[PDB]
Design a protein around this ligand. Sequence first.
Ligand SMILES: *[C@@H]1O[C@H](CO)[C@@H](O)[C@H](O)[C@H]1NC(C)=O
Ligand SMILES: *[C@@H]1O[C@H](CO)[C@@H](O)[C@H](O)[C@H]1NC(C)=O
Lengths: 274, 301
Amino acid sequence: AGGKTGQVTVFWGRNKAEGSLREACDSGMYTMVTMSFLDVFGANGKYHLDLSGHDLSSVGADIKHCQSKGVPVSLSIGGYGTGYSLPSNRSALDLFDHLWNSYFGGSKPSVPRPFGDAWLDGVDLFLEHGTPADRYDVLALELAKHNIRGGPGKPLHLTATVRCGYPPAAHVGRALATGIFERVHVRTYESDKWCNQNLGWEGSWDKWTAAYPATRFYVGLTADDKSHQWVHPKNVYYGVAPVAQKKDNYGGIMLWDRYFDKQTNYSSLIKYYA
Amino acid sequence: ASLNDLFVAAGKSYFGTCSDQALLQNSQNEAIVASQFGVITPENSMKWDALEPSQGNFGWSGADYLVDYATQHNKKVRGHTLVWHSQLPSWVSSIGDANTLRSVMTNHINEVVGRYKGKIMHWDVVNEIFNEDGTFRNSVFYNLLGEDFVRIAFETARAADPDAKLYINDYNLDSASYAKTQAMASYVKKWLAEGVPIDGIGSQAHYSSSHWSSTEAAGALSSLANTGVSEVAITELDIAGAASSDYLNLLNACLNEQKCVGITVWGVSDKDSWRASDSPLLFDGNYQPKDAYNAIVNALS
Ligand SMILES: *[C@@H]1O[C@H](CO)[C@@H](O)[C@H](O)[C@H]1NC(C)=O
Ligand SMILES: *[C@@H]1O[C@H](CO)[C@@H](O)[C@H](O)[C@H]1NC(C)=O
């Protein structure tokens, strides 16, 4: 069986009123912060990062500070918008090159460093939209080459953030079939009538965890205490955490998002259940 | 002093706690349960995942232990809980057919209530059925059976044990003007008028460190009583920080509502709470009374 891991991953970047990345790391509530979202990418060489009006000029130093406190920072690509796709092998390698040389260890004069010499700790795939011809598998395999655990380089935590329902859409399945995703965060706070904390999340959790035994699974919860799919912290202690942790490959809790968590202090108790 | 003896002397039915087999086997904890609390709620052992882990295959060991402890100790029991979306086995939420769910839910209630017939003071028949904005939580029960799941559940429990008081229980019923509280009151009033056998509303009263003021508790509880329901209870009280003045506000919310039968605090020692880091109970991590305990004793003495 699994058990508590103490791991809490939070999303950041969706609301400029949520405070800085530094503030989130300095809270001590999180073991990973995932910036969101690289919302434009595809086959025409155009890329865009959307951090919702947050002050970009502070982000690089804040990433380095988070890391200095032992909190890794990853970047999530995709989101709920319609501005991204990955329709070819070449487009996936071009996206790898953009991520590597913009945000990680690569330096090319022709690739801007939006956050200077800060070097991120992972990539998350939040692929709400896609088609079966997308090649996120190619991207995943290229990122996995740089996940160094001991030696020159540093870890790269490759993750996906997926809808509650199993099985996922084909573009996601194609990526996960590479077998090298470190973590998957299963969103259980959405309004999918048959798959959310109010109805059906556990049966889906059983299918997800069984399908990918080498991957660590995080239960995704909302920190918005007004959401229809919010879980009272007591029901995380009694229900969600003990159930999820029966799986050998339980990894932790994922929280959507820093803005809600800053308002409600959900993680102040959740960090003890994860 | 004994919390239960004092509250009964003050004209109430009980002062209660939660427990279960492991905690009742702990000799420090058990001595406090014995001396202080007249009613016990099973913390987990009567939830559906414990009682009916696969369809028609019931498991009774933990629940039987708690009921037998209470019988032996001349204590009463709040059975907890028959219909709830949380700690529900996945086989139940996988049911796709209304009529199948009606059979499954009726059977679950009939067997559980029937087994303990004549041994249960209150049943939390349905639990946490409302969203914060006053709509029904979209659980498998509501999604397949609609609002009628409530009436079916209460009717089933009543037939299986006519002597148990049947409660609807929920949290965040701590402010009279809050949407959820108003919905609970509205619906219970309507269901009473329709002949649904609801005897009580249970208000859990889980006070966080950023909650409604405990000054609102009296009015909230009275608003639940004012539905015409026969009784109300505070069922799972715990309070971040356990300030005496907050605990007294809740004590007095009960004392000043004629229909409130009692208070249950949700455990004995802080260390065994779901919220231990918030020190929310009446005894500390070495099972010693805290300031709020002494304040309650002074108030009833
Ligand atoms: C992507 O294309 C390259 C060049 O053709 C090929 O060698 C590689 O195997 C492809 N990747 C995958 C995973 O299909
Ligand atoms: C959130 O917790 C912090 C301490 O971690 C505190 O400063 C703040 O007031 C809390 N917010 C609420 C809603 O109590």
